[PDB]
Design a protein around this ligand. Structure first.
Ligand SMILES: C#CCOC[C@H]1O[C@@H](n2cnc3c(N)ncnc32)[C@H](O)[C@@H]1O
Length: 337
């Protein structure tokens, strides 16, 4: 069995391995697909020793196998042992992508043309996800893969859920898992993140980051995240406060000194004015006034690309660690032998 840096037990179909980077649950390599005569990406996942790892693994596999969209990464193949007792790892094979938006923003200035194209592809993929009544819940630059000609594909649905807006309300300072800098303000106030507006906020943060190569709200701890957001948007209006019925949440906002909005064109003086109009509508404080994905696609900033007949939707809407391993075994059976 081939070894890298750790057994990489993917033969014989896949050979000529090359380390790419560490992942949540193991190694990511490129490898030559001796069947399709192309290099692919392979992710080694060793999750069976922790329930939370098994949850994220089953979610990714189940959703990505059901989804088929040009802007969403596919699963080409899954490698594991023939029996549950012998299965200690799972290998997910995907198209090989050159980079991701996180690594790209580290070193590359984006032209306005690239920003517009990236944002269109993000929203086009998100239209399909939301059409299936699914929330991604962890959109951020490192979960946006790019190939050598700047085709973009959303990946990592490990925290994704079915939308559940009737159960979205919670108390003030409720704990949350998804990446801090991309959390909507209502997560810190009264929301579990069970509605589609949680994803639009993240896309808004991603657009701001594309405009300046710096995360717009780099909060350093839970509550600091909310105070970063308020420092740019300014104090919420009386109407937006009155939508927050929870008293601990509302009284915290009331306790803060008045802060004025920072104009987007001051924060991003080189930005296209239409880009900043859309940014404003995505980074709206009140989640019920925040723009939806299909409205965002129809915004003048994206008029070069907008074609709703070429922006498809899904055909239909979409635990102990021992038990999750069983379901992972069964979900991956279609790729055997
Ligand atoms: C798991 C995980 C996240 O970090 C994974 C490393 O794998 C990378 N990566 C993940 N999927 C692919 C992929 N499909 N093609 C190329 N590189 C990839 C990611 O950009 C990073 O370099």
């Amino acid at each position: 069995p081939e070894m890298v840096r750790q057994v990489f037990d993917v033969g014989p179909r896949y050979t000529n391995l090359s380390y790419i980077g560490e992942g949540a649950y193991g190694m990511v390599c490129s490898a030559y697909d001796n069947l399709n005569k192309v290099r692919v990406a392979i992710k080694k996942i060793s999750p069976f020793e922790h329930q939370t790892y098994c949850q994220r693994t089953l979610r990714e596999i189940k959703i990505l196998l059901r989804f088929r969209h040009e802007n969403i990464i596919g699963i080409n193949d899954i490698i594991r042992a023939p029996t549950i007792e012998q299965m200690k790892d799972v290998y997910i094979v995907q198209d090989l992508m050159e980079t991701d938006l996180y690594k790209l923003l580290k070193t590359q200035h984006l032209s306005n043309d690239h920003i517009c194209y990236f944002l269109y592809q993000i929203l086009r993929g998100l239209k399909y996800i939301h059409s299936a009544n699914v929330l991604h819940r962890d959109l951020k630059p490192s979960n946006l893969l790019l190939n050598t000609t700047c085709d973009l594909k959303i990946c990592d649905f490990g925290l994704a859920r079915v939308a559940d807006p009737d159960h979205d309300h919670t108390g003030f300072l409720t704990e949350y898992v998804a990446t801090r800098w991309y959390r909507a303000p209502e997560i810190m106030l009264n929301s579990k993140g069970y509605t589609k507006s949680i994803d639009i906020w993240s896309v808004g943060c991603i657009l701001a980051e594309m405009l300046s190569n710096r995360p717009i709200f780099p909060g350093k701890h839970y509550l600091d995240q909310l105070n970063h957001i308020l420092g740019i948007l300014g104090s919420p209006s009386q109407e937006d406060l009155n939508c927050i019925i929870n008293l601990k949440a509302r009284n915290y906002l009331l306790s803060l000194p008045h802060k004025n909005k920072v104009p987007w064109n001051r924060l991003f003086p080189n930005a296209d004015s239409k880009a900043l109009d859309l940014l404003d509508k995505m980074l709206t404080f009140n989640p019920h006034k925040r723009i939806e994905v299909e409205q965002a696609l129809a915004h003048p900033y994206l008029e070069q690309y907008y074609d709703p007949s070429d922006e498809p939707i899904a055909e239909a809407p979409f635990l102990p660690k021992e038990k999750l391993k069983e379901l992972i075994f069964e979900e991956t059976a279609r790729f055997q032998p």
